């Protein structure tokens, strides 16, 4: 940073939060960012012995390296990191009790992360011309 004059050491936002500082001893400058906070979205089916967990908008590398390591299988879905569900987005269901958003469903037999397609076209093989 170059915005600190000789008398300035703290950078503030319009709400009065400290968002950066120039260290008085080393003159090095740092931006301050809020620690990550959020929610886990747990999909549960009454017939299951466990939960399918969606860490919305987080990559699995972030969840495992910066939130909590776990023994459950995982993959990066479009919606974020999914735990304890099999990646089967090439499969589809017309009804869904565990609607995750953006056309994704959690289906229980293990849990499967699958596409939600509630409506289809009635197709006919008749000629177009």
């Amino acid at each position: 940073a170059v915005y600190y004059n000789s008398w300035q050491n703290l950078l503030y936002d319009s709400n009065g939060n400290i968002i950066g500082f120039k260290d008085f001893v080393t003159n090095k400058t740092y931006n301050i960012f809020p620690c990550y906070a959020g929610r886990v979205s747990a999909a549960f089916h009454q017939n299951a012995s466990s939960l399918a967990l969606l860490y919305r908008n987080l990559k699995c590398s972030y969840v495992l390296n910066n939130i909590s390591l776990t023994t459950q299988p995982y993959f990066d879905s479009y919606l974020g990191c999914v735990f304890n569900a099999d990646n089967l987005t090439d499969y589809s269901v017309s009804s869904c009790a565990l609607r995750m958003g953006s056309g994704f469903c959690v289906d229980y037999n293990s849990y499967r992360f699958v596409t939600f397609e509630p409506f289809n076209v009635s197709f006919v093989n008749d000629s177009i011309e």
């Binding site: 289809n120 076209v121 197709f123």
Partner: peptide, 9 residues
């Protein structure tokens, strides 16, 4: 989607 019928061609 109601009533939508399309040729597969």
């Amino acid at each position: 989607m109601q009533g939508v019928t399309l040729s597969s061609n």
